[PDB]
Design a binder for these strands. Sequence first.
DNA 1: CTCGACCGGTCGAG
DNA 2: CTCGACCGGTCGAG
Lengths: 272, 272
Amino acid sequence: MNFFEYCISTYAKIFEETMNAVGDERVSQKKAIRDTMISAMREFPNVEAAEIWKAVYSAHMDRKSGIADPDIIQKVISAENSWKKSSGHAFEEMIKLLGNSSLEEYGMRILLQKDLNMMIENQEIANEPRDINWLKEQISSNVFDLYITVRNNDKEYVFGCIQSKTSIRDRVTRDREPSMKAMEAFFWSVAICLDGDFLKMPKFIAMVNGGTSNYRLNGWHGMYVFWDKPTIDRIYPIDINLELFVQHAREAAEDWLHRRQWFNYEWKAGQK
Amino acid sequence: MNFFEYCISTYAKIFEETMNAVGDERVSQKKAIRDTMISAMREFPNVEAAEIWKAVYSAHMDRKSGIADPDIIQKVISAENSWKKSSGHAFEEMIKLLGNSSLEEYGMRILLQKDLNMMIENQEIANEPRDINWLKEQISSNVFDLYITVRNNDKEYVFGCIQSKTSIRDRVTRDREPSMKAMEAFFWSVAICLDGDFLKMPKFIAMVNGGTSNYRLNGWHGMYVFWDKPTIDRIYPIDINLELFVQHAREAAEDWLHRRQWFNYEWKAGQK
DNA sequence: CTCGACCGGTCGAG
DNA sequence: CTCGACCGGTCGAG
Ligand SMILES: [Ca+2]
Ligand SMILES: [Ca+2]
Ligand SMILES: [Ca+2]
Ligand SMILES: [Ca+2]
């Protein structure tokens, strides 16, 4: 028996024995991992411990997926990690392309974070230095996916910060705090969401709109969701035309330019 | 053609056309993702945008893995995420079990973070309140995987903080700063590593041992690696018996108990 | 090459 | 049920 065969067979034995006896899969698989690693390092002292750990991984992956072929596994993980890093960029780019075709006629455009970074470096952004510094900090910490600007007196101003998520699933507990900081800094702060399934839970409606003990204030000025459900306070429906986002951006730009002192969290579109 | 067939065929077409023309796979796959999402939302207005995005995912995963079967993909990801969350726990538990069989005869034991959390809550840890508070902060932020204690005058003291990683690959740029804070707090701060391949790079030797412009000070008191390479300053070899870790723990406990003021980053085992 | 950031099913303990 | 933390090949721009 070579070390790899030994690990495969030993992990399976210890898992099965432990699971029949204690009836807890998570405890049993950890025991199988730990005890197979220890046993194999004893039975095979001259094999690198990292290689043994990889054989244990193989055994655990086979049990939990039914797939023993390390090439299949590698290929799926490679593809998944490709999607994980590129798809969010593709979706931001999509929003920018869709939004800019509509916003252009009102003097506005959406920028990627790297667009805004280059424009700040080329001194193309007219905001006050205090804003520029704050935006540079948001860019540094990768807080917002997109930014939106408005042209006024031949100068371009960033007035809004945008989170654009392909899953509204979970990221929103950690996305709310920086959105509230953007509202505190007197920027329009909004989110664009692909899937509204998470808003099934009352918790997530409360995270956006506020008004409960856990979530006293709204977390955004507006949340734009790709669905056909009617508006719930600051949770608005959009489709490929981004209509309410574009019409609210018009109003936000106006108020940011002319009455910015009232652009804290209380600001809401369509109230005038 | 239903929307799913449309997405599969359209992603493939746009990718291939764009890749032959511009010769950049990452640009081309993002264009295929963006333009297939837009095209499909137009061709299929009554399909939920999230479902379209899932069909685009399917197409991208098929191109990059060769696997079209969504069940295979789901099963591999499920298994991978199981390994990702449980294997690190199994390895910590393994170190605790291995270490404690040896350390017991010298009045020492290794605790999991959750062990130390329970013992602090049950007032079983004799450290000064200043230490207790600091440890509670480290537990809160999940900084260390394991802790080590020593019994003195019938009281148990935490004297060391331990990082225990199954890949020394990357985590170490982010693990160094909290280890240096533990040394600043006058605890023994060490790391136990499964795979030393990353120490091929001079950068990572420097991260542990210090003495360069990028890394002026050592990042740990000691790094214990499962390999047979001879000691490089504070990078020590171990196998399943953890020998140098156990012998250095003896010395660390002694010095923490009796001359703790000199247990900053400069402390090193075996120098007396 | 370097190197920081990305994700989401699962784990774990409520 | 809730809910915060885990990872590592890839992306992206050096
Ligand atoms: Ca309100
Ligand atoms: Ca419509
Ligand atoms: Ca030194
Ligand atoms: Ca040995």
